[PDB]
mmCIF file of C-alpha atoms and ligand atoms in Angstrom:
data_model
loop_
_atom_site.group_PDB
_atom_site.id
_atom_site.type_symbol
_atom_site.label_atom_id
_atom_site.label_comp_id
_atom_site.label_asym_id
_atom_site.label_seq_id
_atom_site.Cartn_x
_atom_site.Cartn_y
_atom_site.Cartn_z
ATOM 1 C CA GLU S 5 10.190 -22.674 -4.559
ATOM 2 C CA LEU S 6 7.195 -20.524 -3.578
ATOM 3 C CA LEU S 7 5.011 -22.139 -0.925
ATOM 4 C CA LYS S 8 1.753 -20.841 0.503
ATOM 5 C CA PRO S 9 2.340 -18.648 3.573
ATOM 6 C CA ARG S 10 0.570 -20.310 6.474
ATOM 7 C CA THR S 11 0.461 -17.173 8.649
ATOM 8 C CA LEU S 12 1.564 -13.552 8.526
ATOM 9 C CA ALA S 13 4.787 -14.532 10.284
ATOM 10 C CA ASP S 14 5.363 -17.192 7.628
ATOM 11 C CA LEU S 15 4.668 -14.656 4.888
ATOM 12 C CA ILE S 16 7.254 -12.308 6.403
ATOM 13 C CA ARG S 17 9.845 -15.091 6.477
ATOM 14 C CA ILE S 18 9.095 -15.870 2.828
ATOM 15 C CA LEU S 19 9.414 -12.194 1.899
ATOM 16 C CA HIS S 20 12.840 -12.048 3.511
ATOM 17 C CA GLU S 21 13.800 -14.902 1.179
ATOM 18 C CA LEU S 22 12.325 -13.205 -1.905
ATOM 19 C CA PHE S 23 14.179 -9.953 -1.143
ATOM 20 C CA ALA S 24 17.503 -11.557 -0.160
ATOM 21 C CA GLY S 25 19.020 -10.402 -3.451
ATOM 22 C CA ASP S 26 19.258 -7.135 -5.350
ATOM 23 C CA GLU S 27 16.295 -7.503 -7.699
ATOM 24 C CA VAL S 28 12.591 -8.233 -7.252
ATOM 25 C CA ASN S 29 10.521 -10.910 -8.967
ATOM 26 C CA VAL S 30 7.304 -8.933 -8.965
ATOM 27 C CA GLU S 31 5.090 -11.793 -10.058
ATOM 28 C CA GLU S 32 6.370 -14.132 -7.353
ATOM 29 C CA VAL S 33 6.015 -11.478 -4.629
ATOM 30 C CA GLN S 34 2.500 -10.733 -5.797
ATOM 31 C CA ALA S 35 1.609 -14.430 -5.899
ATOM 32 C CA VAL S 36 2.805 -15.090 -2.344
ATOM 33 C CA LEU S 37 1.028 -11.996 -1.008
ATOM 34 C CA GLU S 38 -2.167 -13.093 -2.741
ATOM 35 C CA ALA S 39 -1.783 -16.646 -1.380
ATOM 36 C CA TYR S 40 -1.627 -15.522 2.272
ATOM 37 C CA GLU S 41 -5.198 -15.849 3.519
ATOM 38 C CA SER S 42 -5.820 -12.896 5.777
ATOM 39 C CA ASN S 43 -6.247 -13.965 9.395
ATOM 40 C CA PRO S 44 -7.371 -10.981 11.470
ATOM 41 C CA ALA S 45 -5.980 -12.339 14.742
ATOM 42 C CA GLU S 46 -2.485 -12.343 13.230
ATOM 43 C CA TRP S 47 -2.532 -8.642 12.379
ATOM 44 C CA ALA S 48 -4.852 -7.140 15.028
ATOM 45 C CA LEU S 49 -1.788 -5.709 16.806
ATOM 46 C CA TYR S 50 -1.043 -3.490 13.808
ATOM 47 C CA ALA S 51 -4.604 -2.477 12.961
ATOM 48 C CA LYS S 52 -4.615 0.830 14.793
ATOM 49 C CA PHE S 53 -7.167 3.218 13.332
ATOM 50 C CA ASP S 54 -7.522 6.983 13.555
ATOM 51 C CA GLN S 55 -10.924 8.594 13.387
ATOM 52 C CA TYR S 56 -10.000 11.250 10.840
ATOM 53 C CA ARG S 57 -7.671 9.664 8.297
ATOM 54 C CA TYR S 58 -5.984 6.458 7.333
ATOM 55 C CA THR S 59 -3.006 5.256 9.352
ATOM 56 C CA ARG S 60 0.248 3.574 8.371
ATOM 57 C CA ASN S 61 1.464 0.885 10.780
ATOM 58 C CA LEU S 62 4.927 -0.554 10.236
ATOM 59 C CA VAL S 63 5.087 -4.337 10.531
ATOM 60 C CA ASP S 64 8.566 -5.256 9.300
ATOM 61 C CA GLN S 65 11.545 -3.375 7.949
ATOM 62 C CA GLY S 66 12.707 -6.194 5.712
ATOM 63 C CA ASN S 67 16.318 -5.921 6.922
ATOM 64 C CA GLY S 68 16.410 -2.711 4.866
ATOM 65 C CA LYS S 69 15.096 -4.160 1.562
ATOM 66 C CA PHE S 70 11.445 -3.322 2.031
ATOM 67 C CA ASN S 71 8.924 -1.681 4.311
ATOM 68 C CA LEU S 72 5.948 -3.939 5.120
ATOM 69 C CA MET S 73 3.137 -1.940 6.678
ATOM 70 C CA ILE S 74 -0.567 -2.174 7.412
ATOM 71 C CA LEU S 75 -2.829 0.709 6.418
ATOM 72 C CA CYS S 76 -6.117 1.164 8.247
ATOM 73 C CA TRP S 77 -8.811 3.070 6.392
ATOM 74 C CA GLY S 78 -11.881 4.262 8.245
ATOM 75 C CA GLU S 79 -15.092 4.663 6.351
ATOM 76 C CA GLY S 80 -14.570 7.241 3.620
ATOM 77 C CA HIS S 81 -10.846 7.588 4.212
ATOM 78 C CA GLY S 82 -8.635 7.853 1.187
ATOM 79 C CA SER S 83 -5.228 8.855 -0.056
ATOM 80 C CA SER S 84 -3.863 11.578 -2.244
ATOM 81 C CA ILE S 85 -3.045 10.925 -5.851
ATOM 82 C CA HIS S 86 0.532 9.852 -5.391
ATOM 83 C CA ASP S 87 3.653 8.263 -6.793
ATOM 84 C CA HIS S 88 5.884 5.648 -5.223
ATOM 85 C CA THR S 89 9.345 7.171 -5.299
ATOM 86 C CA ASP S 90 10.916 4.741 -7.753
ATOM 87 C CA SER S 91 9.865 1.759 -5.651
ATOM 88 C CA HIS S 92 7.803 -1.335 -6.195
ATOM 89 C CA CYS S 93 4.546 -1.156 -4.320
ATOM 90 C CA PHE S 94 2.317 -4.111 -3.553
ATOM 91 C CA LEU S 95 -1.052 -3.643 -1.897
ATOM 92 C CA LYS S 96 -2.967 -6.621 -0.519
ATOM 93 C CA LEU S 97 -6.383 -6.290 1.003
ATOM 94 C CA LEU S 98 -6.700 -7.843 4.469
ATOM 95 C CA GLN S 99 -10.212 -6.602 5.265
ATOM 96 C CA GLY S 100 -12.855 -4.758 3.279
ATOM 97 C CA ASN S 101 -12.524 -3.197 -0.160
ATOM 98 C CA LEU S 102 -10.594 -0.279 -1.622
ATOM 99 C CA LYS S 103 -11.128 1.673 -4.838
ATOM 100 C CA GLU S 104 -7.915 2.217 -6.795
ATOM 101 C CA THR S 105 -7.991 5.003 -9.388
ATOM 102 C CA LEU S 106 -5.115 5.183 -11.862
ATOM 103 C CA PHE S 107 -3.759 8.378 -13.371
ATOM 104 C CA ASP S 108 -1.079 9.156 -15.889
ATOM 105 C CA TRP S 109 1.884 11.293 -14.989
ATOM 106 C CA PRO S 110 0.905 14.922 -15.676
ATOM 107 C CA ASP S 111 2.414 17.005 -18.418
ATOM 108 C CA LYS S 112 4.193 20.290 -17.721
ATOM 109 C CA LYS S 113 1.059 22.234 -18.655
ATOM 110 C CA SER S 114 -1.353 22.795 -15.783
ATOM 111 C CA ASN S 115 -4.406 20.672 -16.565
ATOM 112 C CA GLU S 116 -7.000 18.572 -14.814
ATOM 113 C CA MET S 117 -5.750 15.068 -14.117
ATOM 114 C CA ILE S 118 -8.292 12.708 -15.695
ATOM 115 C CA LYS S 119 -8.405 9.150 -14.384
ATOM 116 C CA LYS S 120 -7.337 6.448 -16.817
ATOM 117 C CA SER S 121 -9.165 3.619 -15.057
ATOM 118 C CA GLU S 122 -10.524 2.474 -11.727
ATOM 119 C CA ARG S 123 -10.973 -0.849 -10.039
ATOM 120 C CA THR S 124 -12.279 -2.317 -6.829
ATOM 121 C CA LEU S 125 -9.692 -4.249 -4.820
ATOM 122 C CA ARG S 126 -11.401 -6.973 -2.823
ATOM 123 C CA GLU S 127 -10.446 -8.993 0.255
ATOM 124 C CA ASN S 128 -7.213 -10.984 -0.182
ATOM 125 C CA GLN S 129 -6.400 -9.536 -3.618
ATOM 126 C CA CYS S 130 -2.870 -8.188 -4.164
ATOM 127 C CA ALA S 131 -2.352 -5.309 -6.575
ATOM 128 C CA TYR S 132 0.874 -3.805 -7.804
ATOM 129 C CA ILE S 133 1.949 -0.352 -8.849
ATOM 130 C CA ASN S 134 5.145 1.420 -9.800
ATOM 131 C CA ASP S 135 5.913 4.805 -11.312
ATOM 132 C CA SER S 136 6.216 3.284 -14.784
ATOM 133 C CA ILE S 137 2.576 2.181 -14.584
ATOM 134 C CA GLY S 138 1.372 5.539 -13.328
ATOM 135 C CA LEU S 139 0.030 7.272 -10.265
ATOM 136 C CA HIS S 140 -2.887 6.202 -8.142
ATOM 137 C CA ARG S 141 -5.352 7.156 -5.451
ATOM 138 C CA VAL S 142 -6.623 4.540 -3.005
ATOM 139 C CA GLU S 143 -9.902 5.075 -1.165
ATOM 140 C CA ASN S 144 -12.209 3.252 1.190
ATOM 141 C CA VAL S 145 -15.512 4.391 -0.284
ATOM 142 C CA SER S 146 -17.517 2.272 2.142
ATOM 143 C CA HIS S 147 -19.918 4.019 4.520
ATOM 144 C CA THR S 148 -20.027 1.034 6.879
ATOM 145 C CA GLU S 149 -16.871 -1.103 6.634
ATOM 146 C CA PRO S 150 -13.333 -0.144 7.640
ATOM 147 C CA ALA S 151 -10.662 -1.505 5.333
ATOM 148 C CA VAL S 152 -7.222 -2.841 6.168
ATOM 149 C CA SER S 153 -4.462 -3.352 3.627
ATOM 150 C CA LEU S 154 -0.987 -4.806 3.696
ATOM 151 C CA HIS S 155 1.574 -2.801 1.735
ATOM 152 C CA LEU S 156 5.080 -3.736 0.698
ATOM 153 C CA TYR S 157 7.446 -1.134 -0.729
ATOM 154 C CA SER S 158 10.874 -1.920 -2.077
ATOM 155 C CA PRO S 159 13.201 -0.154 -1.646
ATOM 156 C CA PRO S 160 11.688 1.507 1.411
ATOM 157 C CA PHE S 161 10.815 5.164 0.988
ATOM 158 C CA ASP S 162 9.858 7.843 3.481
ATOM 159 C CA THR S 163 8.634 10.510 1.054
ATOM 160 C CA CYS S 164 6.439 10.700 -2.004
ATOM 161 C CA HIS S 165 4.541 13.282 -4.013
ATOM 162 C CA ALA S 166 0.907 14.220 -3.761
ATOM 163 C CA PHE S 167 -0.642 15.547 -6.977
ATOM 164 C CA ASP S 168 -3.316 18.211 -7.226
ATOM 165 C CA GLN S 169 -6.040 16.681 -9.382
ATOM 166 C CA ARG S 170 -7.038 20.133 -10.648
ATOM 167 C CA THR S 171 -3.597 21.005 -12.096
ATOM 168 C CA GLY S 172 -1.166 18.077 -11.912
ATOM 169 C CA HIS S 173 1.127 20.065 -9.651
ATOM 170 C CA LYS S 174 2.994 17.980 -7.119
ATOM 171 C CA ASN S 175 4.192 18.527 -3.571
ATOM 172 C CA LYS S 176 6.573 16.378 -1.568
ATOM 173 C CA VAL S 177 5.029 14.687 1.460
ATOM 174 C CA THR S 178 6.816 12.820 4.239
ATOM 175 C CA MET S 179 5.290 9.523 5.300
ATOM 176 C CA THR S 180 4.718 9.164 9.019
ATOM 177 C CA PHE S 181 4.153 5.887 10.857
ATOM 178 C CA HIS S 182 1.217 5.797 13.276
ATOM 179 C CA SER S 183 2.823 2.770 14.929
ATOM 180 C CA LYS S 184 5.858 0.559 14.499
ATOM 181 C CA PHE S 185 5.931 -3.107 15.502
ATOM 182 C CA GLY S 186 2.630 -2.693 17.351
ATOM 183 C CA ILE S 187 3.782 0.332 19.389
ATOM 184 C CA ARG S 188 2.092 3.693 18.869
ATOM 185 C CA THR S 189 4.687 6.222 17.688
ATOM 186 C CA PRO S 190 3.379 9.794 18.224
HETATM 187 FE FE1 LIG W 1 0.083 4.062 -3.355
#
């Protein structure tokens, strides 16, 4: 019985219920993430920005079933084109807007990766991606507004691939956490 999360802490408790088992009801997880109304005071602790690139701030480790993290995107900050390491990946906007560009998996032949579509993710929306859907890039294209997003990955993963848009070639990257549980982790 999915109820509206009243707070971030309530959302986290609900997520622990939704991930108690071995499978993932994607539509229910997405619905509960979308139903949480972002309250900046509840997540200010995790919203630690860096001047030069986006930061990943771990919020909850989901008792091993998922990583819940907050990403903080300065103006003009964006990601690589990347995969999600055979995990579910939910992305909910907490503040601002992000541009999501979707790409197909490259072929063996070296070729330019041409976007398949793009969309603007707005405040409180929750999007979803997995490797079966494709690859994506996420970018804060704003010149004036930092963006903050809440990401849930299940199972948790510490590495993924970045893809060269000019060729489709991929390189393994290790995810680093800027902070964990509100504590800066150099
Ligand atoms: Fe992603």
